[PDB]
């Protein structure tokens, strides 16, 4: 249904002070606001394309797209990842009457284009659409500017439309784009392409958004009237520091807005074998609660994802860490306590609880760092004539202390006269048996419990998470992750010889100063990215825009 239709390297220009949008949906009137967000930097490189030459271009964090035209050549866009009917794609078209927006699964042609010849023709965009989760309809003299973003499942489009007369270039000036649409499409986007309406000339400029700090000025009508890019030159930085658009004569010690970290490196030790989650998780027979089992875990890649298709945990509670940050940490020492209790007593496995299990059988400290996992096991621990193989302790003279065990079987004396064996009137045997039948209510069915307790300290890592390492970048401002220790700064070689076991060394200010590379045991040291001794000599910004730097 579609056909296939010498190229030259595209030229470049600068978006002088264009491409400012509204960062958020709040309403502000008559104020100066300092924001940090994804913006188009001033005097930044835009690619000037055009002859048709429709390429597929990257979509990094957002896109500023500008077009100058006289006869409505530019029609719409397509956004996606593969654009090949194996994933979902977004299509925005304007067929001279309406605005069509479709999130579907298109099989796009290699060179899409609409058709004009003089009613209409040649709708040679795609071949077939299948699933179509989202549908939306609405039934040189011009400069059209757009900013596209997508975050948290929303695709946001901002736009502006101004009349121009200068012909063959993107004019210098200032533009603030008003919000246009906000569609809840919820797809992944990495590439995009534009649709041209053939006749059988116009240009577009493409630039990309980057994280920056801006100073914005809000009108009475909450229309952004001025903006300052605070990483451009020293005058912009001193305007940003004072939060003003004018400066008088002075010296003006300034702050740091000029350097942004770019790369992120990860360094983990060379551990390959996975953890035995499956020999401590199915493990035909578990242990009684009063004689619980403790086991050490070492030399592991602790992957929790190999348990998704086997067990369904009713309870997963971590205390000193966050469950979303277990894939980035290396631990030094890890234990595992396992036992079996009744369904209603799983609430007592927590720091600070009381009852029967937490008083006489198993107790947790107040300052506990670890996770507790529980799951129902009626299919493995319950039998027809009951399963009288798990015991528990009911009578004790005094409460336990954290991580203490008591396997004694004396005769508890509840009355006055001594017992000396011979469990009579006020003498009891202190251990009783759980009876697990397969017809029990959920309150007293068997549950298997595993408690993991790990520590992080200045020592080699034994068990670590499933994160892939990468290359080392030196003499640059990077984020780094060494053995689960994160930071920002510049990595350079040094000579501060460590102890055999030492992993990192701090300084007097209790900030990390040197670190040891895990794979190649070589010391490095960390210095700040910021230079904090720069001053800007300026006359009045009214008289002139020249500065000197000290």
């Amino acid at each position: 249904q579609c056909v296939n239709l010498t190229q030259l390297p595209p030229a470049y220009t600068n978006s002088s002070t264009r491409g400012v949008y509204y960062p958020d949906k709040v309403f502000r009137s008559s104020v100066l606001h300092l924001t940090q967000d994804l913006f188009l930097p001033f005097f930044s490189n835009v690619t000037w394309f055009h002859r048709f030459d429709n390429p597929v271009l990257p979509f990094n964090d957002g896109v500023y797209f500008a077009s100058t035209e006289k006869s409505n050549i530019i029609r719409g866009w397509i956004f996606g990842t593969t654009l090949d009917s194996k994933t979902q794609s977004l299509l925005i078209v304007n067929n001279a009457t309406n605005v069509v927006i479709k999130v579907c699964e298109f099989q796009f042609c290699n060179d899409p284009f609409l058709g004009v010849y003089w009613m209409e023709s040649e709708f040679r965009v795609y071949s077939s659409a299948n699933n179509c989760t989202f549908e939306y309809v609405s039934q040189f003299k011009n400069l059209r500017e757009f900013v596209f973003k997508n975050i948290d499942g929303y695709f946001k489009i901002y736009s502006k439309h101004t009349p121009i007369n200068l012909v063959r270039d993107l004019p210098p000036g200032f533009s603030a784009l008003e919000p246009l649409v906000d569609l809840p499409i919820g797809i992944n986007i990495t590439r995009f392409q534009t649709l041209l309406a053939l006749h059988r000339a116009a240009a577009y400029y493409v630039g990309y958004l980057q994280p920056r700090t801006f100073l914005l000025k809000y009108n009475e009508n909450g229309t952004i009237t001025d903006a300052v890019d605070c990483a451009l030159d020293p005058l912009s930085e001193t305007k940003c520091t004072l939060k003003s658009f004018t400066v008088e004569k002075g010296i003006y010690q300034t702050s740091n807005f000029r350097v942004q970290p770019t790369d992120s490196i990860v360094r983990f030790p060379n551990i390959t074998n996975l953890c035995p989650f499956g020999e401590v998780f199915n493990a035909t027979t578990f242990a009684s609660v009063y004689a619980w089992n403790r086991k050490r875990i070492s030399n592991c890649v602790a992957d929790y994802s190999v348990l998704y298709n086997s067990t369904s945990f009713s309870t997963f509670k971590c205390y000193g860490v966050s469950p979303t940050k277990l894939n980035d940490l290396c631990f030094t020492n890890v234990y595992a306590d396992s036992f079996v209790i009744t369904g209603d007593e799983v609430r007592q496995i927590a720091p600070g609880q009381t009852g029967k299990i937490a008083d006489y059988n198993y107790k947790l400290p107040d300052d506990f760092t670890g996770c507790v996992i529980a799951w129902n096991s009626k299919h493995i621990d319950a039998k027809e004539g009951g399963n009288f193989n798990y015991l528990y302790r009911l009578f004790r003279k005094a409460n336990l202390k954290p991580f203490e065990r008591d396997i004694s079987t004396e005769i508890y004396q509840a009355g006055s006269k001594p017992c000396n064996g011979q469990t009579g009137l006020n003498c009891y045997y202190p251990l009783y048996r759980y009876g697990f039948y397969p017809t029990d209510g959920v309150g007293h069915q068997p549950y298997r419990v595993v408690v993991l307790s790990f520590e992080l300290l200045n020592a080699p890592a034994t068990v670590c998470g499933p994160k892939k390492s990468t290359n080392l970048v030196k003499n640059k401002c990077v984020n780094f992750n060494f053995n689960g220790l994160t930071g920002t700064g510049v990595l350079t070689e040094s000579n501060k010889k460590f102890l055999p076991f030492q992993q990192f060394g701090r300084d007097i200010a209790d900030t990390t100063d040197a670190v040891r590379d895990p794979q190649t045991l070589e010391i490095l040291d960390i210095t700040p990215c910021s230079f904090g001794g720069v001053s800007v000599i300026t006359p009045g910004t009214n008289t002139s825009n020249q500065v000197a730097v000290l």
Binding site: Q253, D507, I508, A509, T527, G532, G533
Partner: protein
């Protein structure tokens, strides 16, 4: 510095770093934002 004998006696009694040297306690406070102007 064309100063007299008495001033030379006075300057010795009272006991008062390039960025190439920091790369003690002065460099520890230079990295945390504290600067001393001349």
């Amino acid at each position: 510095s064309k100063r007299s004998f008495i001033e030379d006696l006075l300057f010795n009694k009272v006991t008062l770093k390039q960025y190439g040297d920091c790369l003690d306690l002065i460099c520890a406070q230079k990295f945390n934002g504290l600067t001393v102007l001349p």
